[PDB]
Amino acid sequence: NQIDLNVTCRYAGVFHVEKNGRYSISRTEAADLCQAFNSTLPTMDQMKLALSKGFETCRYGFIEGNVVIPRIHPNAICAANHTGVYILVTSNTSHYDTYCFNASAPPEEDCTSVTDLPNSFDGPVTITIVNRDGTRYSKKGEYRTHQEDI
Ligand SMILES: Cc1cc(N)c(N)cc1Cl
């Protein structure tokens, strides 16, 4: 009974979360997961500002309304070489990573590690936050509020 959450630096409060090392988050789980970080799904405008401060990934994730990949540098294997906030148009499937937005984060790039999951609820799952530098924070809890996600 374990969930691992790989997290990134924050850029203007926006960060990326990947669950269990693969695309595995539904839209409802995404919202609940951001909730556990005292965060929300970013708006498009919040994502564009994060982009402008240096945020890019090579992974699809939810924002409010769409599934996107922020890209600064063109790369042929990330969002088909596009730059900007690339919006997924056509897909059969429903599970992605997520982006989250924490209003209390610093305004520009914050590449310190995440050391807490402040708004998790009581529960039986060992949840481990894994930072890009390998540092880890664990706690027992739950964040999913929808039966179909559990
Ligand atoms: C929820 C949260 C916790 C910590 N420690 C940091 N550093 C960043 C975020 Cl977004």
- Residue to probe by mutation, ligand 1, list 115, 132, 139, most atoms within 8 Å of CB: 115
Based on the number of CB atoms within 10 Å of its own CB, is 53 exposed (0-12), middle (13-18) or buried (19 or more)?
Answer: middle
Closest CA to 137 of 125, 122, 126: 126
Residue whose tokens read 């992974």: 59
CA distances from 32 to 27, 110, 134, 143 (A): 9, 23, 24, 6
The β-bridge relationship of strands 136-142 and 67-71 is: unpaired
Q: How far is the CA of 90 from the centre of ligand 1 (A)?
A: 33
Q: Any binding-site annotation on 86?
A: yes
Method: X-ray
* 71-93 per-residue burial string, b: 16 or more CB within 10 A, e: under 16: beeeeeebbeeeeebbeeeeeee
